[PDB]
Design a protein around this ligand. Structure first.
Ligand SMILES: COc1cc([C@@H](C(=O)N2CCCC[C@H]2C(=O)OCc2cnc(C)s2)C2CCCCC2)cc(OC)c1OC
Length: 128
């Protein structure tokens, strides 16, 4: 379903161009601008293992997820991916382990060599 579409049609947003991170824009945002590295970004997300066996949403906690973009505080795929988004945009990310938690994984939530999928909504951003 969503994951497969992304494999087929997603844009490669890696620097190395290794298809480790593919993206589809599902809902177009507003503004002419994305956040700059170091901006504080506010997102909602729904995340799962590509095989659907563990799931997670910021909506489960009724709290936006906040981080400083491109500052290495989260998995690489997020730093790279959210930086491509506009305010109000929803995007689908499909993420090979090298841009997530690699072979070590992070048990018990994430196993070795797991592909991740996220729907992310970029609610807002500010250059703090
Ligand atoms: C390995 O740690 C965790 C990872 C995540 C999710 C995850 O991988 N996240 C959370 C959303 C931000 C991207 C990515 C991550 O960088 O996690 C490190 C965390 C930063 N802040 C957190 C509360 S977890 C994971 C995505 C696929 C379905 C399984 C959950 C949520 C977690 O708890 C909500 C978590 O435990 C702290």
């Amino acid at each position: 379903g969503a994951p497969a579409t992304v494999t087929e049609q997603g844009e490669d947003i890696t620097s190395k161009k290794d298809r480790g991170v593919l993206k589809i824009v599902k809902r177009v945002g507003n503004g002419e601008e994305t956040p700059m590295i170091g901006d504080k970004v506010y997102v909602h997300y729904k995340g799962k293992l590509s095989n659907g066996k563990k799931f997670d949403s910021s909506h489960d906690r009724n709290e936006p997820f906040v981080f400083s973009l491109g500052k290495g505080q989260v998995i690489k795929a997020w730093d790279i991916g959210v930086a491509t988004m506009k305010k109000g945009e929803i995007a689908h990310l499909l993420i090979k382990p090298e841009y997530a938690y690699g072979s070590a994984g992070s048990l018990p939530k994430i196993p070795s060599n797991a592909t991740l999928f996220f729907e992310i909504e970029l609610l807002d951003f500010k250059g703090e």
